[PDB]
């Protein structure tokens, strides 16, 4: 039922059908923290790293082509997502990612052994350390795999967010004629188009796409060849060049060998720069969600400017309640990303000399942020945003009854007079138009032009 | 293979062997955010809530005793942890916890139906809403279950942390004779006992236990009977009294019916008060961990004051490296709790009028904090703290070679003279004792008493 | 125009009329960061510390009675707030607070010298280090002073908060009969009294008062006598017991000498505990302020449930605009405190071995939090909360025309009739009450009982 | 001693000699929160805004040429920093910045009145609202001024940072030959040059310069002309084009009128983008400062790899102590910025519909971050970084007696001999180099090449 493996600390039993090994099992004893598994994209990227390294090591004559070809086939299986269940270590873990790198090394070595008809655990023939980890350290393989995983996930977030942004733009278009009252401080102000607010939403999101896209650039620099500390001592420059080109080609990213491997091994600014752009994006999305929730308030004692698609019963006790559950989950995902960014800040700040050992919790958080933003943006776009409808009559009635349309008469008649009219209209509950007429401030004809609400929506002195 | 269920929004297919229902499946479409499951303690507590309610509702004559007895048996199964797999909704979810409450209501209703020989889905006989949720709202059942789960988890953290605190105290005792140099600003200062530092660690942790224990008090107030908004309109006061006593008795906590149900339904300060005490605790533990990592630095170009149990190979490329992986994972768990507390802050701040809809992400975070602190504290206590050893010779050599022992001569001979001696000793690399003798500041006899390092470890003018 | 002073590092020019000295001037070159000054209460508390130490050192025969007496009189002037302008060092400073301790030691020494007719700078007669700092370290004097300052500031915050909490409870009373629509998810639910919301506000604030008051307890333990690292090297144990008693008696706080001075010198959890309770309080206050600003929304396209006292013009372009400026500044002070608390967290976490050197920024933020909360609570209470008025008729009208008011009538009339009444109410203009009367379902007298605000908003039928 | 002024809300007494007015005095009663004043660069930028608007309004025939000319001269005095003392409102204030805009409008109006020989307060002749605020809102004037202030402050930070970055690169050069032990997890690893660490420092700082410089781009889009909500109601489109050009030309920044003024009036992402780049920079700087403080640990029980310039006595009780005060204040400024960034995050998130009213606290924090970073970078560069010295012999000695130096010799000597050499080195006192010589394994000349600092620290064999 079990086999026995060993490292410099001793021996352990492994289930015979497991592809992980001794260093993996030790990580499960050392760090039973969350019970989560690493993201499958990171597993995939680990497999891209070990395939790339095995090819490069063979090409430069360091690795036996017999063993190397099986390492490559096993790594391809990992890349295709065939072995996600064998990656059992905790995302939150001591040892700076060694246990993640070793989980990859062990799984690939053991699967390679099985593919050449050998016994799993026979590290004499295929060693996790000496073959699958050849020319590598934790301190290059783990971050390089993370750069690749983060880049692949960012590319998916970007595509999802461009889709959402475009759906905001379609709503802006659908609502381009819908007039309502703009509010500042939650006080009635002057008229605005609902489509102008939705375009404001589309535009901030366009700016977020650009910020997030631009954070990829610093992740294209990888540190493969760094060895233990970034000096690259005893790394072969031809190994570095060739592994880099394989990593680029198999991952699909324009990866580059960092110009200064010590810089690239010990600094973590590439990661906080990403987390920062994700946070900024979710600030904007939370604000947008808060607006949607206010606009959907009601149905009788709220603003009731829009109707969201109903997505689930709101209450078992208020008959027929529907709640804005999709904006609410967007807010919650924002609050989660805000927190993840503080965990990332604190972990990046904790780096010491040649290595930041806090990267596992940094990378867990950063991947989680990207992943939950992708998922909530997809679900919000499909289950809410596309289906939003406007209560046009209600919003028109707000404009029809406002005081603040009176703003438009300031350049003609003065803020002082308009204020007197505004105060009176507010205290009597009369229409501001009627008051202008009854006091001879303006004629019916000239305030038909001046108090045109649609015309006040683009710049100019009315008239 | 499937059955069909319905709510006021429409019909859905459910796998025939599933105990969840239509509202559950809708939550899985609305919120595919994390893919996590709610903590099993919360599942258990939901079952305590629905059992308690069913008993109270029968006792006051609202619920049929035939259906009620099966609801109770099903809820007991949930309480014992037999149905954790049927709780499939995302911890991060819109609808303020409705989908969590409905997952409980559905699972219990359906299991109850199966126990009385009926068809799952036959809500005519046993309704998730009308029977299992009777006299309840999301807005009391969900927070009440959370109070119970948080209290049970806090009690386990407290016990784990008292164990850790006691193991720190044992190390303080083991090291009570071990002399070393105290450092301020990382500059050599005056002698201290290693056992005094470990007692400083034990004492802050004692203070953390007290803070965390004291946060339970505000969670003992529950809001069962609140109905939709806290008014309790149409709740039966005898139902409230009786359900409270069952909740207390089955959960083991001294629960109390809040004095003002509107306050208790809309305020979330009980939760941030807990998160705050957890954060403070992890600030202290991170600092302690950082100290341990500095003391274990080396082995030749570091401080090398202590040796930690080796827990995994440190490197595949530095021969025989061992890294302080257990302190490192403690730091990472701190950074995670710091972030979780910011998510909790932001979610509590977002409450509006009669309900804080952001509670799902608040409660996910708070439970995660308590849970990961418990797990890392257990693992750190067993896999590191108990086994720590002191390099007594090294630390003694620091004291033997220090400048700063010279502090003790200030009251005798003046800070001005001691400074001259200190500077000289620092620039020549001579022993400060020899300099005192050679310049006739003190006799060999009087500085044998005065520069006794052990005596400078407790208050007094040396002499 | 200058004198020359000297420390371990060499000599510096000091303005002839200055009471600070060489170690102070160096700090002003090293840390020109914010341009702020330390809080006057911290200056005061430093004066309490140096007075207390001078008395204890004299009593134990370590300090000259005559020189000690002048140190004490100079310290008393500092305590009374006469020399705040001589405390020039930046609150954000390296050195772990040495520069603040030295600013006190120098000002006091020099003023003491002036009081005995000597020249400022004559450290031969009265030394900042040897006399004013005798038996002490930065690492006990500076924290002890901070514990005392923070305690004093907390006591004032608590009194201000208790005043605000009581004014919320008066508004709860004023509004005890005012009915409105409760909202969950911002969706119309069932009726609630405005007074119940204000009471929920007052109750959370009561809980905050308790949390904050309870953070004082760990600050009453001081480390005076710890000297450099908590070992108490060069502090006589009788000096420690005497200085502690003077610190308690002059400060008015029940200070205690910590049970383990090494613990109390290196751990900073008393400070994060305080910051935490301040953050939690401001979370609740921010939420309350958010609710107020929603209730004040309008005048015609908003909820318009309450009217806040007008405090300033809202706009120089929109005629008639007035804005909820006092809830808004409450929000902003919350966001400030949240941030201050993260700075405090990060500084506390950065402690190393025997000393946390990041205390200056930690204490600057903590004292800032306490201070801005006191000031905004006072201003918000006097300029907004006391004057809040309810639009009772508006709120009643929406309750009368809601769906949710059906909930009060359901057990009386049964679900079948309730549904028919609800349907009619949707399609006609009419309130459920009027319809109950029109169709003889309930009598006007029975509806007066059933839809009584208190009765629709409490448990029972 | 007083005059009387009046707004929409009524009349107030103003000190006769004050240039501020009624809306300003009300703000000083409403918000006595911090006691701070807005940054002088924001005052300056407000003056640029009001000058620019007065010129555009005149050009378009909306404002009297004569009154406009006095408004402009008064604005120019504000721009030159002559009236900073008249800006008394608190940076933390409700009203979304109205009180800051009004403080500018009032000071300028009153000074303009004094320049034409009129009485301060005579708003009949020159109105804060009607003339100085003409064609504007708080909601365009205040942000536009902030964009300009922040841009100016960023440009100074960038220049200061570039100076610091270059001084790190000079130290990398000075230390290019200095070998020491690289450490991972604080465990001894393999040799590294001190110069490579300093170059890693310089390179991250280069990346920070780039991030921060790139945040300017979104600030060049301004919303002047948006008026209340971005619709531009009451702003003539030719006024918008002319005021934008004046704003660019007087400020020296390439300002552009935002493409959608409603977007630019309600969204605050340009500000969080800036705060984010500042936070990221200070994360890196804090880490660097942590490393410096570890390298400076000692003198006898620490690493003692570097010596920092001494800047102040470390202790008045421990003789001889000097502390790394300049890295320490760098840490503390980082923690400050981290917190400021959370305040900024929370304020930005709190935007509602057409306006984010939490901008005053957001801008106070953002400007504070930029300002304290500039000041600490300058002071740290001049008072520490330039003067850092290496303990080269100490560092070399530990490299020579390490295990890790074996790594350079392994491919030359093969694993079997390397292990024998390592074992011997552990048990005897002797360095691997000496042992290589003693046992004829390698020649002294071959060891000079192999263990050359540059050669053991770069890829290859
Ligand atoms: Na988190
Ligand atoms: Na701050």
**CA–centroid distance, residue C356 to ligand 2 (Å):** 20
The reply to whether C116 and C196 lie within a common domain is no
**CA–centroid distance, residue C331 to ligand 2 (Å):** 14
- Retrieve residue A115's tokens: 């593919």
d(CA B109, CA B97): 18
CA dihedral A167, A172, A177, A180 (to 10 degrees): 120
- Residues of B whose CB is below 8 A from C266: 197, 200
3-state secondary structure of D320: coil
3-state secondary structure of D118: coil
Neighbours of D449 (CB within 10 A): 11
Q: For residue D422, which of B319, A134, B310 has the smallest C-alpha distance?
A: B319
The reply to whether D130 and D146 lie within a common domain is no
Residues A330-364 as b/e (b if ≥16 CB within 10 A, e otherwise) read bbbbbbbbbbbbbbbbbbbbbbbbbbbbbbbbbbb
- Which of residues B118, B134, B150 is at a domain's end? B134
Known catalytic residue at C315: yes
Q: Is there a contact between D31 and D94 (Cβ–Cβ < 8 Å)?
A: yes
Look at A182 and D225 and tell me if their CB atoms are within 8 Å: no
Inter-CA distances, C342 with A37, A345, C214, Å: 30, 11, 21
Length of chain D in terms of residues written: 461
Beta-carbon contacts of B229 under 8 Å, excluding residues fewer than 6 positions away, are B139, B262, B265, B266, B354, B355, C182, C184, C189, C190, C192
The shortest CB-CB distance from B460 to any of C230, C237, C267 is to: C237
- Position of tokens 């002490």? C136
CA D66-D72-D73 angle, to 5 degrees, is 95
- Retrieve residue B95's tokens: 């609808």
d(CA C6, CA C255): 36
Residue C70 lies in a domain: yes
User: Please, which contacts does C2-10 make with residues 24 or more away whose CB atoms are closer than 8 Å?
Assistant: C3/C119, C3/C120, C3/C121, C4/C121, C5/C121, C5/C123, C7/D312, C7/D313, C8/B419, C8/D313, C8/D320, C9/D310, C9/D311, C9/D312, C9/D313, C9/D322
Look at C185 and B228 and tell me if their CB atoms are within 8 Å: no
Cis amide prior to A299 (ω within 30 degrees): yes
A439: domain CATH number? 1.10.40.30
DSSP-derived letter for residue B233 is B
A329 shares contact with chain B (CB less than 8 Å) = yes
Backbone angles phi, psi at D388, to 5 degrees: -60, 135
Q: Which residues pair with D221 in a beta bridge?
A: D256
Q: Is there a contact between C256 and C221 (Cβ–Cβ < 8 Å)?
A: yes
B115 shares contact with chain D (CB less than 8 Å) = no
Beta-carbon contacts of A14 under 8 Å, excluding residues fewer than 6 positions away, are A2, A3, A4, A5, A20, A21, A22, A25, A120, A121
Q: Is there a contact between C90 and C34 (Cβ–Cβ < 8 Å)?
A: yes
Length of chain A in terms of residues written: 463
**CA–centroid distance, residue A140 to ligand 1 (Å):** 26
Cis amide prior to C299 (ω within 30 degrees): yes
Chains contacting chain B through 3 or more C-beta pairs under 8 A: A, C, D
Q: Is there a contact between A203 and A168 (Cβ–Cβ < 8 Å)?
A: no
Q: Which residues pair with A6 in a beta bridge?
A: A11
Catalytic residue among D130, D241, D315, D346: D315
Q: Which residues pair with A133 in a beta bridge?
A: none
Cis amide prior to D299 (ω within 30 degrees): yes
Entry resolution (Å): 1.9
Burial class of D200 by CB neighbour count within 10 A (0 to 12, 13 to 18, 19+): buried
Residue C26 lies in a domain: yes
- Residues of A whose CB is below 8 A from B32: 375, 379
- With left for phi above 0 and alpha for psi between -120 and 50, is residue A185 left, alpha or beta? left
d(CA D204, CA B9): 55
CA B216-B217-B220 angle, to 5 degrees, is 90
The reply to whether C276 and C387 lie within a common domain is yes
**CA–centroid distance, residue D351 to ligand 2 (Å):** 20
Compute the 3-state secondary structure of chain D and give helix, strand, coil in percent, each to the nearest 5. 60, 10, 30
The answer to whether the Cα torsion of D224, D227, D229, D232 is positive or negative is negative
* A187-193 vs A221-222, strand pairing mode: unpaired
Backbone angles phi, psi at C73, to 5 degrees: -65, -40
The answer to whether the Cα torsion of C290, C291, C296, C299 is positive or negative is positive
- Which of residues A134, A161, A180 is at a domain's end? A134
d(CA C186, CA A7): 60
Catalytic residue among C315, C371, C402, C431: C315
Q: How far apart are the first and last CA of chain D?
A: 86
Q: For residue A350, which of D289, B183, B385, D369 has the smallest C-alpha distance?
A: D289
| D351: nearest CA partner in chain A | A287
Beta-carbon contacts of B182 under 8 Å, excluding residues fewer than 6 positions away, are B189, B190, B191, B192, C228, C229, C231, C353, C354
The reply to whether B125 and B242 lie within a common domain is no
- Which of residues D392, D413, D445 is at a domain's end? D392
CA B343-B349-B352 angle, to 5 degrees, is 130
- Position of tokens 């939370």? A286
- Retrieve residue C106's tokens: 């120098």
Q: For residue C343, which of C92, C14, C50 has the smallest C-alpha distance?
A: C92
Backbone angles phi, psi at A152, to 5 degrees: -60, -45
| B399: nearest CA partner in chain D | D301
The reply to whether C147 and C74 lie within a common domain is no
Look at C96 and D341 and tell me if their CB atoms are within 8 Å: no
Give the distance from CA B272 to its chain's centroid. Answer: 13
The reply to whether C148 and C93 lie within a common domain is no
Task: Tell me which H or E stretch contains C368.
Answer: helix C359-383
Look at A342 and B347 and tell me if their CB atoms are within 8 Å: no
Q: Is there a contact between D288 and D329 (Cβ–Cβ < 8 Å)?
A: no
Residue A181 lies in a domain: yes
Residue C65 lies in a domain: yes
d(CA D254, CA B84): 61
Q: Is there a contact between B448 and B438 (Cβ–Cβ < 8 Å)?
A: no
| Closest chain C C-alpha to D80 CA, distance in angstroms | 21
Residue from C181, C182, C185, C324 whose CB has the most chain A CBs within 10 Å, to mutate: C185
D335 shares contact with chain B (CB less than 8 Å) = no
3-state secondary structure of C5: strand
| Closest chain A C-alpha to D57 CA, distance in angstroms | 12
Length of chain C in terms of residues written: 461
B62: domain CATH number? 1.10.275.10
Compute the 3-state secondary structure of chain B and give helix, strand, coil in percent, each to the nearest 5. 60, 10, 30
d(CA A275, CA B426): 46
Backbone angles phi, psi at D38, to 5 degrees: -65, 150
3-state secondary structure of C28: helix
The reply to whether D130 and D190 lie within a common domain is no
C 118-137: CB under 8 A from D: 128-129, 133, 136-137
d(CA D339, CA A244): 39
d(CA A146, CA A389): 42
Task: Tell me which H or E stretch contains A5.
Answer: strand A2-7
Q: For residue C149, which of C274, C29, C260, C25 has the smallest C-alpha distance?
A: C274
CA atoms within 13 A on the CB side of C66: 4
d(CA B227, CA B216): 24
Q: How far apart are the first and last CA of chain A?
A: 89
* B306-307 vs B389-390, strand pairing mode: antiparallel
**CA–centroid distance, residue D339 to ligand 2 (Å):** 5
CA D69-D70-D73 angle, to 5 degrees, is 90
C427 shares contact with chain A (CB less than 8 Å) = no
User: Please, which contacts does C67-70 make with residues 24 or more away whose CB atoms are closer than 8 Å?
Assistant: C67/C112, C67/C116, C67/C125, C67/C126, C67/C131, C68/C131, C70/C112, C70/C113, C70/C115, C70/C116, C70/C126
Inter-CA distances, B308 with A93, B312, C59, Å: 17, 12, 48
Q: Is there a contact between B148 and B251 (Cβ–Cβ < 8 Å)?
A: yes
Strands (E), D171-269: 179-184, 187-193, 221-222, 256-257
C 190-249: CB under 8 A from B: 190-192, 196-197, 199-200, 203-204, 207-208, 211, 214, 218, 225, 228-237, 240
The reply to whether D193 and D302 lie within a common domain is yes
- Residues of C whose CB is below 8 A from D98: 312-316, 323
Q: For residue C123, which of C59, C67, C45, C60 has the smallest C-alpha distance?
A: C67
How many CB pairs (< 8 A) connect C and D?
A: 241
Beta-carbon contacts of B68 under 8 Å, excluding residues fewer than 6 positions away, are B54, B55, B57, B58, B131
**CA–centroid distance, residue D355 to ligand 2 (Å):** 23
**CA–centroid distance, residue D373 to ligand 2 (Å):** 13
Compute the 3-state secondary structure of chain A and give helix, strand, coil in percent, each to the nearest 5. 60, 10, 30
SS (H, E, C) A202-217: HHHHHHHHHHHHHHHH
Q: Is there a contact between D106 and D125 (Cβ–Cβ < 8 Å)?
A: no
CA atoms within 13 A on the CB side of B333: 32
Q: For residue B104, which of B42, B150, B147 has the smallest C-alpha distance?
A: B42
Inter-CA distances, B163 with B166, B169, B276, B333, B379, Å: 5, 10, 22, 19, 12
Q: What is the CA radius of gyration of chain D?
A: 30
d(CA D7, CA D99): 13
Look at A343 and B328 and tell me if their CB atoms are within 8 Å: no
Q: For residue D40, which of D157, D151, D153 has the smallest C-alpha distance?
A: D153
A353 shares contact with chain D (CB less than 8 Å) = yes
- Residues of C whose CB is below 8 A from A293: 185-186
- Retrieve residue C142's tokens: 């500076």
CA dihedral C56, C62, C67, C73 (to 10 degrees): -10
A52 shares contact with chain B (CB less than 8 Å) = no
Length of chain B in terms of residues written: 463
- Position of tokens 């020649």? D443
The answer to whether the Cα torsion of C297, C299, C305, C308 is positive or negative is positive
The reply to whether D84 and D207 lie within a common domain is no
Burial class of B445 by CB neighbour count within 10 A (0 to 12, 13 to 18, 19+): exposed
Q: For residue C18, which of C86, C89, C68, C101 has the smallest C-alpha distance?
A: C86
d(CA D334, CA A349): 10
Look at B418 and D187 and tell me if their CB atoms are within 8 Å: no
Name the domain count of chain A.
Answer: 3
* Gaps after residue numbers in chain B (C–N over 2.5 angstroms): none
Residue C194 lies in a domain: yes
d(CA C385, CA C162): 14
Backbone angles phi, psi at C185, to 5 degrees: 70, 15
Q: Is there a contact between B283 and C348 (Cβ–Cβ < 8 Å)?
A: yes
CA dihedral D411, D415, D418, D423 (to 10 degrees): 160
Q: Is there a contact between D97 and D84 (Cβ–Cβ < 8 Å)?
A: no
- Experimental method used, please? X-ray
B329 shares contact with chain A (CB less than 8 Å) = yes
d(CA A51, CA A42): 14
CA D425-D428-D431 angle, to 5 degrees, is 40
The reply to whether C411 and C360 lie within a common domain is no
**Closest ligand (CA of A275):** 1
d(CA C283, CA C330): 10
Task: Tell me which H or E stretch contains C2.
Answer: strand C2-7
Residue B398 lies in a domain: no
- Retrieve residue A61's tokens: 């004559």
| Closest chain C C-alpha to A77 CA, distance in angstroms | 44
Residues A101-133 as b/e (b if ≥16 CB within 10 A, e otherwise) read bbbbbbbbbbbbbeeeebebbebebbbbbebbb
The answer to whether the Cα torsion of A244, A248, A249, A254 is positive or negative is negative
How many CB pairs (< 8 A) connect A and B?
A: 223
D 279-298: CB under 8 A from B: 293-294, 296-298
- Residues of C whose CB is below 8 A from B227: 190
Q: For residue C262, which of C297, C229, C228 has the smallest C-alpha distance?
A: C229
The reply to whether D48 and D104 lie within a common domain is yes
The shortest CB-CB distance from D188 to any of B189, B299, B402 is to: B299
* B389-390 vs C2-7, strand pairing mode: unpaired
**Which domain, by its residues, includes C439?**
401-457
Residue C240 lies in a domain: no
Q: Is there a contact between B79 and B44 (Cβ–Cβ < 8 Å)?
A: yes
D188 shares contact with chain B (CB less than 8 Å) = yes
Residue B282 lies in a domain: yes
- Retrieve residue B377's tokens: 């504290």
Q: Is there a contact between A196 and D262 (Cβ–Cβ < 8 Å)?
A: yes
- Position of tokens 């760090």? A31
d(CA D419, CA D413): 10
Q: How far apart are the first and last CA of chain B?
A: 89
A73 shares contact with chain C (CB less than 8 Å) = no
Q: For residue D78, which of D57, D53, D96, D58 has the smallest C-alpha distance?
A: D53
d(CA A439, CA A428): 15
| B321: nearest CA partner in chain A | A8
CA dihedral C16, C17, C23, C26 (to 10 degrees): -70
CA dihedral B156, B161, B162, B163 (to 10 degrees): 90
**CA–centroid distance, residue B339 to ligand 1 (Å):** 5
B368: domain CATH number? 1.20.200.10
Beta-carbon contacts of B333 under 8 Å, excluding residues fewer than 6 positions away, are A33, A92, A361, B282, B372, B373, B376
Neighbours of B374 (CB within 10 A): 19
The reply to whether C279 and C313 lie within a common domain is yes
d(CA A342, CA A272): 10
d(CA A400, CA A432): 10
- Residues of B whose CB is below 8 A from C411: 234
Look at C318 and A293 and tell me if their CB atoms are within 8 Å: no
**CA–centroid distance, residue C337 to ligand 2 (Å):** 7
d(CA B423, CA B404): 11
């Amino acid at each position: 039922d079990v086999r026995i493996e060993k490292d410099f600390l001793g021996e352990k039993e492994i289930p015979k059908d497991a592809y992980y090994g001794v260093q993996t099992i030790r990580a499960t004893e050392n760090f039973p923290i969350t019970g989560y598994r690493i993201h499958p994209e990171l597993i995939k990227s680990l497999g891209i790293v070990k395939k790339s390294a095995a090819l490069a090591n063979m090409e430069v004559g360091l690795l036996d082509k017999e063993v190397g070809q099986y390492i490559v086939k096993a790594a391809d299986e990992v890349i295709e997502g065939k072995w996600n269940d064998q990656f059992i270590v905790d995302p939150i873990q001591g040892g700076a990612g060694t246990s993640i790198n070793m989980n990859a090394n062990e799984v690939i070595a053991n699967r390679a052994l099985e593919l050449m008809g050998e016994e799993k655990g026979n590290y004499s023939k295929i060693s996790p350390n000496s073959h699958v980890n050849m020319s590598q350290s934790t301190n290059d393989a783990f971050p390089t795999a993370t750069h690749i995983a983060v880049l692949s996930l960012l590319n998916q977030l970007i595509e999802t967010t461009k889709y959402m942004q475009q759906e905001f733009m379609k709503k802006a278009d659908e609502f381009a004629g819908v007039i309502k009252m703009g509010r500042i401080h939650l006080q009635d102000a002057v008229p605005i188009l609902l489509g102008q607010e939705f375009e404001a939403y589309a535009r901030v999101i366009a700016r977020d796409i650009e910020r997030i896209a631009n954070t990829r650039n610093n992740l294209y620099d990888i540190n493969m060849g760094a060895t233990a500390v970034g000096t690259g001592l005893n790394a072969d420059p031809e190994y570095i060049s060739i592994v880099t080109e394989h990593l680029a080609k198999f991952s699909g990213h324009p990866l580059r060998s960092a110009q200064h491997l010590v810089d690239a091994t010990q600094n973590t600014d590439c990661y906080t720069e990403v987390s920062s752009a994700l946070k900024v994006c979710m600030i904007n999305m939370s604000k947008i969600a808060n607006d949607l929730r206010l606009m959907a308030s009601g149905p009788r004692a709220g603003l009731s400017e829009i109707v969201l698609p109903a997505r689930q019963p709101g209450s078992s006790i208020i008959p027929g309640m529907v709640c804005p559950v999709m904006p609410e989950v967007m807010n919650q995902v924002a609050f989660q990303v805000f927190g993840n960014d503080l965990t990332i800040t604190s972990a990046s700040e904790a780096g010491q000399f040649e290595l930041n050992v806090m990267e596992p919790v940094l990378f867990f958080n950063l991947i989680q942020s990207i992943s939950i933003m992708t998922n909530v943006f997809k679900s919000f776009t499909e289950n809410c945003l596309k289906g939003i409808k406007a209560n046009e009559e209600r919003m028109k009635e707000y404009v029809e009854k406002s005081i603040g349309i009176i703003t438009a008469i300031n350049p003609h008649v003065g803020y002082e007079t308009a204020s007197k009219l505004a105060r009176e209209a507010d205290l009597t509950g009369e229409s501001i138009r009627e008051l202008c007429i009854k006091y001879g401030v303006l004629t019916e004809e000239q305030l038909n032009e001046i108090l045109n609400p649609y015309e006040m929506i683009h710049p100019g002195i009315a008239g």
